[PDB]
Ligand binder design. Structure first.
Ligand SMILES: CCCCCCCCO[C@@H]1O[C@H](CO)[C@@H](O)[C@H](O)[C@H]1O
Ligand SMILES: [Ca+2]
Ligand SMILES: [Ca+2]
Ligand SMILES: [Ca+2]
Ligand SMILES: [Ca+2]
Ligand SMILES: [Ca+2]
Ligand SMILES: [Ca+2]
Ligand SMILES: [Ca+2]
Lengths: 330, 330, 330
């Protein structure tokens, strides 16, 4: 079968300050789920073997994809069977695919965990550690709850300054998932450059959650270190704890706290986000996100109101943001 | 339901002069309808409420969309019901959506009304007054013929020179539509800049038509004023009258006259366009457009032979153009 | 009917040297068939007349179409019937459409015939002689084996230096095709520029093949001359002979030899490619290509490992390449 699918998630959003201390408001996107358009298919080859493909790109409903539509979210071909699944092509790397599942705000909107970000202003295409070009991944079956994923992305001799392997990824995870309980440990290294100097991006991530039915609790710890070959490092420890709960048959409330300990500037930022999702149907929801981000000292982090304002703020400033929108899946 | 749809409209076209006085001919597009590719869907949410989405982009069949496919024609999500319809996302603004309906050449090809154009070389993304980014619109039901539409597009602090609200749109229309008779009054203001100086783009548009069955008569008047905050204005009055008629069961003839009174250069341009559409089926037509554009004095307007030549001509020159093509809808 | 179709063909690839003499390896694409995504449709208009359209673009699975999706492979509208077929829009020109059919590696991957390439560093959009913007083509029916195709692409006064008709194409072919036997003669001229000086790109191509069932033999000869108006020429004679055979019910082996006699640098390059395709189903195949390219003297040609390395090599160097991949059609 071949399936056309997508999501259009568009919102109004506001932040009280930008890099100049001025408020911003506007029409933005992707507050509850990332807006997307894709095609996927699966073919039974017999003998339990299946071939697949998946082409997916982000949608920007506020500007009609003004910078041009692509398939940067995923563009894979695969084989799958009793051995698991092997995929070739651009995709989420295994470490982000698995560990972002512990973020109650699904790595989008103003609310989400910010650990997967380019903390060091690395010069690679994907120094947020989320996706990779030139990726091969292998995902095992789940046996008795245990499951794992592994990926390698080729650098293809991409060269920036003294780095001649920019974009290489090697990484994977081990996990236990039984339904209500989930826990995962991810480890990855990317090759990059910072200021034209070869640098490793090392990331270790631990996540766990338990779904009690009446509520779900979820936590994530992560250390990301950009270690420059000649010496020096930009190290960040990121922490998150959240809870969600169904409210009355068609609603869901979510609350998440995060802390970002940015060692290179000896500064912390703390974040609290409250969210609500109200389902009008299985495919259509209204939602609201309210977030507060407190930078200390030299920290300049800003909330990610996509399509409105997602830059930084002045050092040590607190920022408040709101998003209210509709998400429609098809 | 989700519907894939589109139009491929490709033509041969000719103009007798360009900005150097040389003829041009070629393979162009979109002479009878704008070529497009889109997806749209509607979901019944119960209780008379519906959710929708619509993603549509222009097609350029002469070059395979060489500059890259996007969804700039419309990228909305909506809710609709007995209250009307609310849409979020890039789209036609209500004033252009409603008032371009009075142009017998459908705001495309060499023939159409040129009132919705960037008369002042405004620096905004959409200073032709046709579409807007970051748009929210509301369309009422039609009650007893009466209907209205309203839109607001956020500027998001887009800054060019002394303008810090570039791209803002506020506008709407009131109308009467009973089938044979249609009349509408539109009013809109956009924020922009001209030469780096903050400028309002003010537009008032009146249109009416009557469909007698054997023929249709249609007219449009418009004043567009770019009023610069420090003083000065580029004002243009635009007028059009046209008629169409079915010819023999599968044909249609169209004739339209327009005048553009460009106050800032004390010059007028007059235009006459004759068109014919021959239906081979409900979805496939052959067509021809013949146009004559007479610039007086300092006027340099040119016919819009998309994909062939759509620039200006030398001051005071007359230009003739022809387009012959096929339009295929799917 | 309207049909969505495509191919995702992604591979691992290696070449032993690049322009610096270093090996390269990576995740690439399109080793067995060019990866693509398209929509096409046909409408019966009655009386044996049909309207069609076809929109197709290349897919780059290794990077998610990072530079943006388009319809550059084909974006046509057509009419067809007992007279043949007329198409308007960007497409393969008739000479490449017909003559590339003699290449056993289908003008893609490391293995294919390289005759359709920009031998002179022409400055036109399509100086490889493969596709054209602004194209009108006519294809006859096949009567008693005989068939022909003709195309004209408008230049639209595209100007580069002293060339004011850049991109013009005039060309066509005559052929005999009866099933097992195929032979074709193509002739074409394009207008271009080299170093800002007007230049004709003249191409004559002869191809033939015979399919014995147990094996197929195929050959191609081509002369491409870039003849500069003020004098001088970059002339290349290109030759290829290949064979293919089914192996055991789901396999196919292919072997092709080519020679490129580059007169402007008095140098030859020779190429040998071995390929295997193993079908897992009618739509899904695994494949491998192994190629050896020997440059003599000043020749610097390189193998085309798309998405890994497709540049040149140092003068007189031999290069080896390998591609192993999966092709999945839908
Ligand atoms: C950027 C280009 C967007 C590609 C849009 C893909 C449209 C697919 O269209 C879909 O596919 C199937 C085949 O027609 C059908 O089942 C459905 O009618 C349709 O929903
Ligand atoms: Ca897949
Ligand atoms: Ca916006
Ligand atoms: Ca909609
Ligand atoms: Ca053109
Ligand atoms: Ca066609
Ligand atoms: Ca694009
Ligand atoms: Ca690659």
């Amino acid at each position: 079968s071949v399936t056309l699918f997508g999501i259009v998630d568009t919102n109004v959003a506001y932040v009280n300050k930008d890099a100049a201390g001025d408020s911003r408001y506007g029409l933005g996107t992707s507050g509850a789920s990332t807006s997307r358009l894709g095609l996927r298919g699966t073919e039974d080859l017999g003998g339990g073997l299946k071939a697949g493909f998946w082409l997916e790109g982000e949608i920007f409903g506020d500007d009609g994809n003004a910078s041009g539509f692509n398939f940067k979210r995923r563009s894979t071909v695969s084989l799958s069977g009793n051995f698991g699944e092997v995929r070739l092509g651009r995709d989420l790397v295994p470490t982000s695919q698995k560990l972002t599942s512990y973020d109650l705000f699904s790595a989008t909107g103003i609310g989400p965990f910010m650990g997967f970000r380019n903390w060091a202003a690395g010069q690679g295409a994907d120094d947020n550690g989320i996706r990779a070009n030139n990726l091969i991944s292998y995902y095992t079956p789940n046996f008795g709850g245990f499951n794992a994923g592994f990926g390698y992305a080729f650098d293809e001799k991409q060269t920036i300054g003294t780095a001649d392997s920019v974009g290489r990824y090697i990484g994977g995870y081990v996990a236990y998932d039984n339904g209500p309980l989930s826990a995962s440990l991810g480890l990855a290294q990317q090759k990059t450059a910072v200021g034209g100097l070869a640098t490793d991006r090392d990331e270790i991530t631990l996540g766990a959650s338990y779904n009690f039915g009446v509520a779900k609790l979820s936590g994530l710890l992560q250390q990301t270190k950009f270690k420059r070959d000649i010496g020096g490092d930009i190290k960040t420890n990121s922490y998150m704890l959240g809870a969600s709960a169904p409210v009355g048959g068609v609603g869901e409330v979510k609350l998440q706290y995060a802390l970002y300990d940015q060692k290179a500037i000896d500064s912390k930022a703390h974040q609290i986000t409250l969210g609500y999702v109200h389902n009008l149907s299985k495919r259509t929801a209204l939602y609201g996100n309210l977030a507060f981000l407190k930078n200390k000292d030299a920290s300049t982090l800003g909330l990610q109101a996509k399509g409105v304002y997602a830059g930084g703020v002045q050092a040590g400033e607190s920022q408040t943001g709101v998003q209210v929108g509709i998400r429609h899946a098809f």
